[model samples]
Target: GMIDIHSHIVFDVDDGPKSREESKALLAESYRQGVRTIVSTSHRRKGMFETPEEKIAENFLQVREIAKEVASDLVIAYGAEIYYTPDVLDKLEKKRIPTLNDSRYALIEFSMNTPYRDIHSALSKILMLGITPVIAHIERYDALENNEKRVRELIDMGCYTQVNSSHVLKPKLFGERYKFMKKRAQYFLEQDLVHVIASDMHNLDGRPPHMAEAYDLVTQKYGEAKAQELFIDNPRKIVMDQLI
Candidate 1:
């Protein structure tokens, strides 16, 4: 249905699927849902989920080989959802981090509990380095969760944004907070703040990459062309290292 810009389907690299078979299963599911491109955004939380840049590149190549063997016609790209920190720009400069599709766009994230001003520090610096920053799951930022103005400010600073499609689908039995989170996520679309609807898909079990349900909702309300722009065009630009 769309090019998933953020995902962790590369097994054993992070908390995604642990085996190559499960990783294949995840790709098979995504293929069924009509996704042809996937950016493998394994987590880059320092001391937690982060994989060394050199090693991550190796893993990315390995996974793509597996996808080909399975005959899944998925076009894969390498990227990272970097946990935002003041020194992240330095990390990128030193090649300690990988950018989205190894392009100028960097998919960044922050502590949900962190302040908006603190986020500005990292974003501003990324821009200073001439690297475009795409905030991962913009709905997760506390300021954007409660205030539209804050989200606008982020946009004004020339940042791209992403929101998870699962939030659009209203996946079954969502917890109380997730229901609330999805409510805020809707505002991202309503306010035209959502630049990308990525499947921050983690694995085959609960958080899969299939986007049919979310895509159908958007297509019904916004028309197929709009859905295509959000799911395909914009994402293609991000991976291709072009401005959105």
Candidate 2:
């Protein structure tokens, strides 16, 4: 089944749908886009003061109830896109961060403006703790924008990369930034570094639930086989803890 490995469908938890009404709308949009399953990845970090784990669990239960009422065939799971910082590996090791499929694969994010001081070391620590790190939105990393070698090094370190759907279609902000993102996507795909492509969608309006468009673009650029591996099979494998 097609699963969006990243999303903020849990109501009032993060920057996602604030009410049940909006949450339902977002699910409908996802369903229409042929997404059979969704991992409700609420943002968990130092800031934003998100709901506690117990409350987040309660929110997921409510989401399940709403899904049943709507008769939507979308399966939902709980996860957190943890923003990487000091002591993150400790939290992950202590079972504070939600691992994918309750296994070792943890979806992680970094700052947009600042480069991670010890990205390699942090990834090593995660691996040492038996947690596979899936770097969220690798395309947004400013350091890797023009540094294909650095990006490759992360992949060599056994870190999987996630590409945001909007980034695939990001318009040029001048100075070849758009071209750069496209190139980065191409590089990742070519190197077999990308494991999943997600909407990372926040709301119904600005970042609407859409993956087919990006999937089509990927398939057209690559072949249907490669696109399926990244968009469908690989994500399911990661979610099922089948990736080593």
Candidate 3:
């Protein structure tokens, strides 16, 4: 409904759309769902999902152009949902990776069952490089769900948090896969742990882009101010690099 800080709208990248037309259609669908700005945060796993930069940029530019024609008011930006590991330091050091629109905020994560080995060390290195880490899909983390104090620790360490939209709505959207079994969305929302609420949208059918319902839900349950903070105001500051 506001700025979607996370999405995977790029064509044929990761688990997102397979064609440019699909990309356009998805963006148009997002616009219809009340999304105004979209950041293309396709996955960037070391070996599994990473796409070449030039190729990613090419898809982004073309899809962005198509989205502009689809919805003249829609704003499109580029970034990645970078998977964190010691190896990722190489990419960051070489400046081969993209931050959140070249700002200091970088969206990152580990696989759900990873157990967060060496996470603090990895985040330490990232912070040392002058990049502020924004944890992607915070609700999916295995350690944090069982021990919420772990989530607090990350924030205390100066990291922001993100959550997927459908997860909060109890969407069996992609059921159980991606460890969406446990419902931690409302807890994070209640604690105000969430800095960004993203679509993390990968397709037009299965995990379609939408946010208006969630916005209404948040405003109704939490209040308009909380909705504005997570869905718009905070993300606005993120894009402006004001958070770091």
Candidate 4:
């Protein structure tokens, strides 16, 4: 079964759907696109003004109830798009934020503008704590955009990079930006640096559910075998904490 590891279907929890109607619309679109399973990864950070843990849990329960009513086949799981901060490890250890796949893997993001000064040390600490750091949206990181060596370094450190589906298939207007990011994505995939491909969908207008389309492109470009591994097998392994 196809699974979307990351999604923002929780309404009004963060910068996703505003109302319940819009949230249901997004869920319907994902169901139409053949996503049998999905992870409701709402935002969680120290000072970003997002939903608290109790609220996030409540939202996921509400959405699951709605999914049953719509007869949607999507199997929803709980997660958070956690923003990396100084006390991330402490928060994680305290169970303040939910880990990805209910295992050691955690979906973590960095600042778009600021550089991750202690990224290596932070990831090292997580690994030492028996936690796998799944770097969310690695393609959007400005530092790693031109530095393939650093990306490889993180891979060597036992960090898995997650690529958003939209970043791979859709090309932006800026010349070579999209092309460069696609090349990086392919590089990661070829080197087995990428462990999972997630939707990371935010809204219905700009970033709708695009997992099926991206999976189609992956199959067409990388053949069905590798695509299946990236789209289905690897995700299952991650959730189950199995070897990739």
Number of the top lDDT candidate? 1
Predicted candidate 4 versus true structure: per-residue lDDT over 105-215, tens digit per residue: 788788765465567777788787777888887877776765678888987888888888876675656654457667666666666566678888878888887788889
Model 1 per-residue lDDT tens digits across residues 1-244: 3688899888778888788888888887887888888998888887688667677678778889888865556888888888876667788987678888878988999987878888887788888888888899887777678687888888789898888988876545744447766887787787778888888988866788648778888889778887888799999998888887
What's the lDDT for candidate 1?
0.82
Worst lDDT 10-window in candidate 4: 169-178
| Residue-wise C-alpha lDDT for candidate 3, range 9-107, written one tens digit per residue | 888778889998888888887888788888888888877886888898898999988987887889888888899967777787677888887788889
Q: Which ranges of candidate 1 are over 4 A from the true structure?
A: 171-177
Please give the clash total of every predicted structure, in order: 1, 0, 0, 0
- For candidate 4, the TM-score is 0.89
- lDDT for residue 29 in candidate 4, whole number 0-100: 81
Ranking by lDDT: 1, 3, 2, 4
TM-score of every prediction relative to native: 0.93, 0.89, 0.92, 0.89
For model 3, the superposed segments whose C-alpha errors exceed 4 Å read: 171-182
RMSD of 3: 2.4
The candidate scoring highest on TM-score is: 1
Please tell me which model should have the higher TM-score, number 3 or number 4. Answer: 3
Q: Candidate 1, which ten residues in sequence have the lowest lDDT sum?
A: 169-178
Q: After superposition, how far is residue 146 of candidate 2 from its true place, in Å?
A: 2.7
Q: Candidate 4: which stretches are off by over 4 Å? A: 113-117, 170-192
Query: Model 2: runs farther than 4 Å from truth?
Result: 170-187, 190-192
